[PDB]
Amino acid sequence: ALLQVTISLSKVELSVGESKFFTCTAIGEPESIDWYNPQGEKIISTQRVVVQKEGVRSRLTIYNANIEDAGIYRCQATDAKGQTQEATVVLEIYQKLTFREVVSPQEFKQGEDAEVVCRVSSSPAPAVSWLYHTTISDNRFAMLANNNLQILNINKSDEGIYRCEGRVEARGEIDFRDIIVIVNVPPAISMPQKSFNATAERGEEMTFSCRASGSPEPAISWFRNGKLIEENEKYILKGSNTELTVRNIINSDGGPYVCRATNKAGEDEKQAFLQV
Ligand SMILES: *[C@@H]1O[C@H](CO)[C@@H](O)[C@H](O)[C@H]1NC(C)=O
Ligand SMILES: *[C@H]1O[C@H](CO)[C@@H](O)[C@H](O)[C@H]1NC(C)=O
Ligand SMILES: [Ca+2]
């Protein structure tokens, strides 16, 4: 029948930092068109909260909305008569699922107690969850109150990808992250023979096998008497230094040849004895 006011939106809810504008149409012939913050102050223009007034509409733009922004805004018109209609819009500022400062290739040592870390958060407290394939909860895996999952005896097969999924049932909002898990495993030397034997002056020869086990794969360095063993014409090592061949053994070559195997998770050393 008579004067009335409308707004582009009625109920909006945006993340923090998000921006948006609303338009207030005043169907009629208003002399007055004014906005009001949820505090009841007649909005004045600021380059972050801007108010543009044209014709019979009025646009209110909120840039990078913070938390002091939520509330019931009101556009309110007034003609030459005392008639004074208004429309209102409800703004809700919230927090998207954030995953701040969350490193991946997370490394852990074979035996230790691992805690895979996922720093995730949202306005209504997120509902986090850990997946491997697919869910997980096997009396060795458990989610701490801080959202991280722990693995008590992080065996190396445990090594893999883990999804830290998070949902906000209040918004049907979901988002995950995929973390890589690395199981560092100290070196484990393996050499079937640690006691060899050739004949002196005769141009005999002997190869010495030393294999290891670890993640990363261990580096095998040999030592003799007190010096690192280099190749030379005397010794020839091939299989990434897993096979030490001593050429032209005399009497002086008899005795321990020590085998070192190293990685970032420790070291193992075993030696062979060469009898002449
Ligand atoms: C050569 O040395 C090994 C050391 O394990 C020993 O068992 C073996 O008896 C030796 N060979 C001979 C023919 O004695
Ligand atoms: C689990 O698998 C890894 C594979 O590298 C191995 O290191 C570990 O010994 C295994 N543990 C069990 C329970 O068999
Ligand atoms: Ca923006």
Side-chain angles (χ1 to χ4, degrees):
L2 272 307
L3 181 276
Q4 99 283 21
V5 175
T6 99
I7 296 198
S8 62
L9 289 323
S10 58
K11 164 164 183 169
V12 330
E13 57 162 7
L14 69 193
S15 183
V16 44
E18 281 308 345
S19 307
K20 190 146 289 174
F21 59 112
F22 318 86
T23 315
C24 174
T25 295
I27 307 77
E29 44 193 2
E31 310 306 330
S32 144
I33 336 85
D34 325 76
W35 280 93
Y36 295 95
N37 47 42
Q39 281 72 23
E41 323 161 46
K42 165 190 285 179
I43 295 174
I44 230 63
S45 213
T46 279
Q47 75 162 349
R48 170 186 155 278
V49 163
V50 185
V51 166
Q52 313 127 74
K53 214 300 294 289
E54 176 174 340
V56 105
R57 309 167 225 259
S58 169
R59 182 165 283 171
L60 180 262
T61 311
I62 279 64
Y63 293 101
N64 293 75
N66 50 236
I67 199 46
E68 196 73 30
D69 281 336
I72 295 154
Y73 295 77
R74 307 147 37 201
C75 193
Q76 178 180 304
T78 278
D79 56 6
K81 180 164 298 183
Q83 198 180 26
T84 292
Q85 262 278 69
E86 91 173 356
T88 78
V89 48
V90 176
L91 180 47
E92 302 176 17
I93 281 66
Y94 71 92
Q95 150 141 47
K96 148 174 40 187
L97 292 175
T98 52
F99 287 73
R100 73 210 169 208
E101 299 189 24
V102 289
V103 61
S104 189
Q106 296 182 355
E107 283 189 317
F108 304 101
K109 189 206 188 69
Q110 180 64 54
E112 81 185 45
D113 284 310
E115 168 160 326
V116 204
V117 168
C118 183
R119 318 184 61 207
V120 59
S121 52
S122 49
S123 269
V128 193
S129 176
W130 289 87
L131 314 170
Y132 195 114
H133 342 271
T134 285
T135 187
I136 198 58
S137 50
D138 301 12
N139 285 155
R140 204 163 70 79
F141 303 72
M143 204 180 100
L144 324 176
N146 71 160
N147 296 322
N148 305 166
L149 85 147
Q150 74 158 190
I151 319 174
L152 284 284
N153 224 28
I154 17 68
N155 147 293
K156 184 190 167 187
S157 69
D158 302 352
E159 192 169 48
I161 327 71
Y162 287 71
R163 183 165 289 193
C164 171
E165 152 158 317
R167 315 165 323 279
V168 172
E169 270 90 334
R171 295 190 299 260
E173 160 180 31
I174 173 174
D175 195 13
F176 59 86
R177 288 301 183 283
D178 284 351
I179 299 173
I180 288 74
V181 133
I182 298 307
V183 191
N184 293 327
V185 298
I189 299 186
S190 179
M191 55 160 176
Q193 284 183 161
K194 307 186 191 72
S195 194
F196 307 63
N197 60 341
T199 191
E201 289 291 10
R202 288 174 186 173
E204 268 267 55
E205 198 189 43
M206 301 266 79
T207 305
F208 306 117
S209 168
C210 182
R211 281 149 138 245
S213 326
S215 276
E217 275 204 1
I220 305 172
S221 57
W222 302 78
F223 299 92
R224 170 59 170 185
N225 286 327
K227 60 135 165 57
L228 178 59
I229 287 186
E230 313 285 328
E231 207 170 63
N232 278 214
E233 67 162 348
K234 221 347 180 75
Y235 312 112
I236 177 57
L237 38 79
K238 32 269 187 286
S240 203
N241 309 352
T242 65
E243 313 290 23
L244 176 72
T245 321
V246 184
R247 315 169 45 185
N248 283 326
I249 95 287
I250 26 63
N251 52 0
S252 88
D253 283 314
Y257 284 85
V258 150
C259 173
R260 204 213 194 194
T262 45
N263 53 220
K264 59 203 291 300
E267 45 177 327
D268 201 349
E269 304 85 348
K270 307 197 161 188
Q271 50 186 327
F273 183 77
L274 185 271
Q275 186 58 284
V276 185

